[PDB]
Amino acid sequence: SALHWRAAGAATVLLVIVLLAGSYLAVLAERGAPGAQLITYPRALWWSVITATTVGYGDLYPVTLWGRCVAVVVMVAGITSFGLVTAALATWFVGREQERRGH
């Protein structure tokens, strides 16, 4: 199995991990901050997804330094993962296009 496929495969795994970990850590970091809503795990996971995909609807978000730091890591991993998938696809199309040209 080529690397772009294997990497794309890994990116997925790590992303899911980042989501779970970021969910856990967001709660740990936000409880204790008056008025924070990112304090229960189920909605904390939803928040992590909507952040990683960059949808960010605005229903939930961190107010503390650490919550925002955790948030950045989720953002980055999310943009990179989906972005790496794009890389793999391009690589996939390139290879086959070369073949289609007899190369």
Partner: antibody
Framework: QVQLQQPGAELVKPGASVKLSCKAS????????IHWVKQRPGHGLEWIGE????????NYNEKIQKKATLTADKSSSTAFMQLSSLTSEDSAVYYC???????????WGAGTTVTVSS | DILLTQSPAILSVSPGERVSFSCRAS??????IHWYQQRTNGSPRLLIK???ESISGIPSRFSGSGSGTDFTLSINSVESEDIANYYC?????????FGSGTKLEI
Amino acid sequence: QVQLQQPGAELVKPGASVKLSCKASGYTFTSDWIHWVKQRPGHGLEWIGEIIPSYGRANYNEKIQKKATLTADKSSSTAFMQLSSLTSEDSAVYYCARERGDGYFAVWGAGTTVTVSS
Amino acid sequence: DILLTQSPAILSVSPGERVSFSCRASQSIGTDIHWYQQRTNGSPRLLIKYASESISGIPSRFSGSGSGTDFTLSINSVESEDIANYYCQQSNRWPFTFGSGTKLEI
């Protein structure tokens, strides 16, 4: 079986401190939070604080005078609440509770009636 | 800090009659509300979670409803054993808070 075991009573002289416990049994998860609730005779329930055993962090009520200090023992599955420099004003029932990190108190301990007298 | 107002503080009802307790949050909180029943000398016990979700062990007689700011805990055909104090509790914003409570008198 009783998920949370709490001592029946604790007599404390004014100015002294006491350390309440809360033995936990049953299913346990890294996302569990143990809350403490004060209730004086004839009155409502007051949120005192909380702590997450898996990590060891605890938060407290900012609307009241901090008298408690929460700790946890992962090996013995026991949560402790240190109350210090108590006065009659601190005489009440202190309940411990378990929240699966989803916002509600699924189970409460029987409660420890603390009396502050000489 | 969300203020949960429970009024009236006491509710007189006749046997087998329907009753409804009220709990109003100072601000909107979706359906992040939990109801507890505490009998004389008894420890608090969860009745309804997230405004209307049932709980195992609890009688089908108990029901919940509402969203936003106004929540209601209902009981169809109240019987002697329902006598006790009732509290709502929010988990929408930190820190979690409790309503002052409503006593049920038969």
